[PDB]
Amino acid sequence: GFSTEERAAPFSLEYRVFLKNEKGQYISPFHDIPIYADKDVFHMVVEVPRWSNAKMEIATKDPLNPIKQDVKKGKLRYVANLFPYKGYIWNYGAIPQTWEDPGHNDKHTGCCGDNDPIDVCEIGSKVCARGEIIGVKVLGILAMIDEGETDWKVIAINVDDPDAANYNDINDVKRLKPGYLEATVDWFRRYKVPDGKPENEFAFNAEFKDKDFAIDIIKSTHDHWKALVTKKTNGKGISCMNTTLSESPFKCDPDAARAIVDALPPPCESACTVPTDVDKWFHHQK
Amino acid sequence: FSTEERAAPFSLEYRVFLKNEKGQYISPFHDIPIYADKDVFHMVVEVPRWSNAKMEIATKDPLNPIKQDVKKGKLRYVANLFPYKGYIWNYGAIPQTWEDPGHNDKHTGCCGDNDPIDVCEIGSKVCARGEIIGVKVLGILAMIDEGETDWKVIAINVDDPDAANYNDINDVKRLKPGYLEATVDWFRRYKVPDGKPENEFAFNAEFKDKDFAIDIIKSTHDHWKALVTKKTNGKGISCMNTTLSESPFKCDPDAARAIVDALPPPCESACTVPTDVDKWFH
């Protein structure tokens, strides 16, 4: 359904991954990819493949949401290998046309939105690619508190997984992939510890909520997103520019999108070398 | 040392041969001295940390190149045992060692598994297939595999920035907590995803210390010596080599080169690693 246009070399500061539809029009992965792929099937924008380390995400404040690599203190960011794990333990990404409005306090957690699309942890066997669009069955949700803010972690599976029919709610994950949900909480708890930050906290005693609860949350975030691109709520720095939303004042001609991408350095097929330190293991007393 | 690869990575005919600094082909089983330096063992790296292809020195092939294992007609890959990705250490062998079957271990009661001694290297750098490094030996684990004894040496790359901190098995326990527990877990459960059990250990699955390990290693080096001087029958082991003057099996450089040049030529693009390799096993 979709394709990728990459500017500059992977793992440089200039690297940008833009999205294209079937006709070759540049689109925002944040705004132009429909939340649903089919009945009961959500789209997922894949940001980081399982077992990779580069911290890539949809650029919420840059025109045309590209996916790009996070930076702190001037350095390209890579997540730790938290022993016994290698990098990211699932395919990781966002559900498009979702937004955690920072104006909205969540009732269950008491905190406000983090201003980002809702995050998804995809648990299937296939290792997906950066920028790939897939369809997923939602299974459950985790409520992490990320520095005072509500940060939902949706648990899901690629609808095209050979075993996908066996997974319909969160209990199937406990049953068919034991230790997995436990590892997920552990990972999100400790992932910033090697950066000299404390562990993260969770609502609901770091328990997972089921499918229906997850889908309720996702629906709300989609309604908040509706308000965003339709200009009935303060955008708050977010770039709403899009290429397909008829009902949006922020819609733009495909050639204006083209002008943005072309100002950027050309596609460089050869990735930069990932620093050697990234391969290090971070152990801890358990 | 450097590497000559033949054919396409992850095909049946893929082979990695070793060369010395002068470009002469050598056996990684027989021609690399057991010692890099005083108290420093050479290790032939077979398998990088986090990879799955089950590659090993071919004990029965001329010049003992590294190649991929084959069971039931299929190229072997180890499972991703959940929570792990592939092999959790760099994995390889100490050269000029041989577990002689027909030597029984006193502590174990089982006989040798007919291979060089195995090494789990625990440093931070991911090493490459075919790489020769130097390691400090720290301890040893004894796995019981089919009536045979199968030693697993614990070691660290002597060039690891932190190597000076590691002098015995307790240093691992203190500096890399969880590591040894995970090693036993891995060795216990790997190959449960294909077939059944395979989980037994001597010594109640404890790690013996450095001095115990070095005694075992020296022991297999002595048995290796007999092998290549033909004072013990290899029964199929290829002892061909190019540096051992005391060996009836020494051949000249051109002879080794002819053996290598008979394999398919080097190939750039790898073969496709099967997608089923990325599955997790819980």
From Swiss-Prot, chain B:
Give a brief account of the tissues where this protein occurs.
Expressed ubiquitously.
What is the reaction catalyzed? diphosphate + H2O = 2 phosphate + H(+)
**Entry-linked InterPro entries:** Pyrophosphatase (IPR008162), Pyrophosphatase_sf (IPR036649)
Keyword Plastid in the entry? The reply is: no
Gene Ontology CC: cytoplasm; cytosol; extracellular exosome
Enumerate the cofactors the protein uses.
Mg(2+)
For the modification Phosphoserine, the affected residues are 247
Q: Name one GO molecular function term.
A: inorganic diphosphate phosphatase activity
Task: Report the transmembrane regions from the record.
Answer: none
This entry's Enzyme Commission designation comes to 3.6.1.1
| Assembly information from the UniProt record | Homodimer.
Instruction: State the name under which the record lists this protein.
Output: Inorganic pyrophosphatase
The lineage is: Eukaryota, Metazoa, Chordata, Craniata, Vertebrata
